[PDB]
Design a protein around this ligand. Structure first.
Ligand code: ZN
Ligand code: ZN
Ligand code: ZN
Ligand code: ZN
Ligand code: ZN
Ligand code: ZN
Lengths: 90, 90
């Protein structure tokens, strides 16, 4: 196992964890630190701050990391453009 | 019918066209101008230049409008972050 957080990529951790669904449909491997962040639903806030792709929810203005598999399940693409939190879209 | 391009929204056009799949699974209505842009695969280049969400393909650096239903079918979310054109990912 290797942690699938590119900025991390450790092979040693006190405990392995699971992350997002891969394009294979299988579930990514994360180290204890990165996996804890993912479970907290703050993976992209913690690791992808500098990256391109951030938009704002159309209703609450929460920052949403688009074009990113790690946040895919929490972002709704809206019918006429833009994105919403799963809360605010549904 | 009303063109589902928010910057447009006309109700009069010489010819109606179809756009992206809606979250209902049905297919959006676009006027002749916006629909032509969509068929050309340059809708987001033509209308969403100023918007947030643009990333670069991990391999060819093409600009890809993420968090956007109009480009959803042309963008692959990669297993470890970032995006690729359908060409470069597959
Ligand atoms: Zn890690
Ligand atoms: Zn992210
Ligand atoms: Zn929201
Ligand atoms: Zn139009
Ligand atoms: Zn777009
Ligand atoms: Zn590409």
């Amino acid at each position: 196992k290797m942690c699938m957080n590119a900025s991390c990529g450790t092979t040693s951790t006190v405990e392995w964890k699971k992350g997002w669904p891969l394009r294979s449909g299988l579930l990514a491997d994360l180290c204890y630190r990165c996996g804890s962040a993912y479970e907290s639903s703050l993976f992209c806030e913690q690791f992808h701050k500098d990256q391109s792709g951030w938009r704002e929810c159309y209703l609450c203005s929460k920052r949403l990391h688009c074009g990113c598999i790690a946040s895919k399940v929490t972002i709704e693409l809206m019918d006429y453009g833009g994105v919403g939190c799963s809360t605010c879209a549904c």
